[PDB]
Subunit: 238 residues, 3 copies
C-alpha cells in the first residue's frame, strides 16, 4: 500500500491505498510504518519524503464512521495505540523527513503531517481538522497542534473546523513552502537533498533532542486519551 | 450585575456593572461566576456568550488604586484567589464559550477574554495589558499570555503596554473575528450556535482535555503569585 | 572586551572583541557576564542595552571549529559556559534590550533571545546555521522552541537560512526594525520607556516571567550532558 523510490540518498515513499484519498486503514498504517523503519535502518538513505501521489490526497485520515461505531473501550484503545504508533514511527526516523502534501490532509492526515521535519503543500491543497464538526473527539489532534503551534492557534483550528487552504496554512505557519501540484514532489525532494547534506551525526543528535518532548507528549496523550472511553463503556456496559 | 438572556440553546451573559467599563469589582466577579455556574449546570444551555453590553467595555479590569492600597498579606492573596477563581470559572464551563469584546479589555478584562474558547472583537475595540506601565505586577497576565500565545508574544505585549487595536489583535491572533460593534453580539451568538451544534459528548471531552493544562497552569500561578506577596 | 556607558539610568554595554563580529570567546563571555552583573547590582542603573557596536556584528557566536574538536571535562565546560552566559542575561531583573546590527549567528542568536526586547537594523541578519555546518543545535532548538514554539523552531534550525529584517519581523524575532544609524538610539529610547515602569512590579513580574526560561535552560544544560556520555 506504498511504493518506495529513490532519488539517490533520498527515499520517496508514496502512499498507495486503493482509494485516492489515502485513508489510514490498518493496512496503510502498517505499510507506512514498515517503510519508515526500512528507510531509517538503510544506510544508503539520508532523507525521506512522504507523498500521497499525483492527483491523490496526502491522507483523508481515519474513517470517522468507523470510529463512532466502535463497540468496545478496547477497540478504541487499540485504535488510539495505532494512531500514536503511526506518529511516533515518523518522529523516530533520525534522518530528515519531508511531507509533500497535495489534495487533502484531514484529521489523522493533518496530524501525520505535523510529525515531519518540514512540510510543503500544493497551492491547491487543504488541511482540515474537522473532528468536532463530525462528532469525533479531537483530543489527540488538539494535543499535537497545541504542542506544534501553541494553544490559541490549536483552539482556533479545532473549534472552527474550516478547510485551511494554502494561504491559510502559510498564515498559521503549518507549512514551509507552497508550490504548484506539478512542482511539489520535486520541491520536496530538493529540500530533502539539502537536509541530507547536513552532516548526519550532528543532525541525528539534534533531531533526537528536538523530537524527544514531542514523543513524550504523544505518549502522555496515548495514556490520557484512552481514559474517558474506559469510563464511557463502563457505564453503558452496566 | 449581569443579565442573562437566551437565543434558544445559547445563554448570553451581559456584564452590567454600574460603570459602563465593567470593572471587576468583587460583586461583578461573583455575579459572573454565579451566571457561568448556572449556564454550566443548565441542560437547556448548549453554548455561552459573554458580552460587556452595547456601548460598554468588555472589562476595564480590576480597580487599580485598590491593588496599590491593597497592602496586607491576607488582602493581596484574597485578591489573587479571586482573580484565578474568576478565570477557572470560565475554563470549567464544559460547553462552548464565546467572548464578544467591545470597548476595552484591559488587564483582568484581557486575561478574562483569553479563558474563552473563541473571541470576537469590534473593529473599534482595544485589548491592553498596561500593568507594568502603571506599577502593577503582571505575573498572572504574563503566565496566561505565555500559555495561550507563547513566550515572545507575551513579552512583547506585557513590556510594551500598548493599546492593541483590532488589526493588532488579528496580527497577534488574540481574536478569531473582527466585526462592527453593531454586528458583534449577533456574530458571537452565531458562532455559539455553530459550536453548540457539535455533538456535546465529544466536545465536552475534548474541551476538558484542552483546558486541563490551562487550569493546571492557573493553579500553579495562584500558588506562585501568593508566595511572592508572602 | 566590552565598554560600559550610561544614558542616565540606562547602562549601555557595547561588545568590543578585537574581531568586529564579536565572537563569543571565553574572555568576551566573562566580560559580558561581569558587565551584566554590575548593571544588575548598580542601583543607579534602571535598564540595560547590549549592542555589538557601530559597524560590527551583535555576535557571530562561538567558534564552530573549536566545538568540533572538544574530551568530556571540556565538553561539559563549554555547555556550562553557554548556558551560564544566557542565565546571566535572564537573571538581570531590570529591563534588557538587545540592539542587533550585522550578524546574530548561533550563540549570538540564542543570546539575543534572552533579552526582554530586541531591535535590529534593517541590514542585520539572524542565523542558526549549526546543522548545515555539522554542529549540534540542541541548545538553540530548546531555546527557540521555548521562545517561539516548536514549528517555528523546526523551520529555523532545519533551513539554516540567513534571516533578514523582514523575515525576523515575520517570525516575531524582533520588536522593531530601524536603520543602523538609528538603532542604538531607538534601543536606548525603549530602555528609557521600560526603566520608567515602577521597579518593584517590574522586577517581580520579570522574575516570574523568566523563571520557566531559566528552568528550561537548566534542563537543557543537564540534557546536553547526559547525552554527551
Amino acid at each position: 500500500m506504498v511504493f518506495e523510490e529513490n532519488s539517490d540518498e533520498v527515499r520517496v515513499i508514496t502512499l498507495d491505498h486503493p482509494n485516492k484519498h489515502n485513508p489510514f486503514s490498518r493496512t496503510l498504517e502498517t505499510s507506512v510504518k514498515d517503510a519508515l523503519a526500512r528507510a531509517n535502518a538503510d544506510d544508503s538513505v539520508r532523507a525521506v519524503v512522504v507523498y500521497g501521489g499525483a492527483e491523490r490526497s496526502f491522507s483523508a485520515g481515519g474513517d470517522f464512521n468507523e470510529v463512532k461505531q466502535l463497540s468496545r473501550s478496547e477497540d478504541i484503545e487499540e485504535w488510539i495505540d495505532r494512531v500514536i504508533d503511526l506518529y511516533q514511527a515518523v518522529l523516530n526516523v533520525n534522518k530528515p523527513t519531508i511531507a509533500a502534501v497535495d489534495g487533502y490532509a484531514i484529521g489523522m492526515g493533518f496530524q501525520f503531517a505535523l510529525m515531519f521535519d518540514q512540510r510543503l503543500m500544493a497551492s491547491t491543497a487543504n488541511f482540515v481538522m474537522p473532528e468536532l464538526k463530525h462528532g469525533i473527539g479531537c483530543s489527540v489532534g488538539a494535543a499535537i497542534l497545541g504542542f506544534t503551534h501553541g494553544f490559541s492557534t490549536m483552539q482556533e483550528i479545532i473549534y472552527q473546523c474550516q478547510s485551511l487552504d494554502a494561504p491559510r496554512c502559510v498564515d498559521y505557519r503549518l507549512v514551509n513552502q507552497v508550490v504548484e501540484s506539478s512542482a511539489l514532489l520535486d520541491a520536496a525532494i530538493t529540500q530533502a537533498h539539502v537536509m541530507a547534506s547536513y552532516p548526519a551525526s550532528a543532525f541525528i543528535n539534534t533531531k533526537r533532542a528536538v523530537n524527544k518532548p514531542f514523543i513524550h507528549l504523544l505518549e502522555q496523550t496515548r495514556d490520557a486519551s484512552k481514559a474517558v472511553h474506559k469510563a464511557a463503556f463502563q457505564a453503558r456496559d452496566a
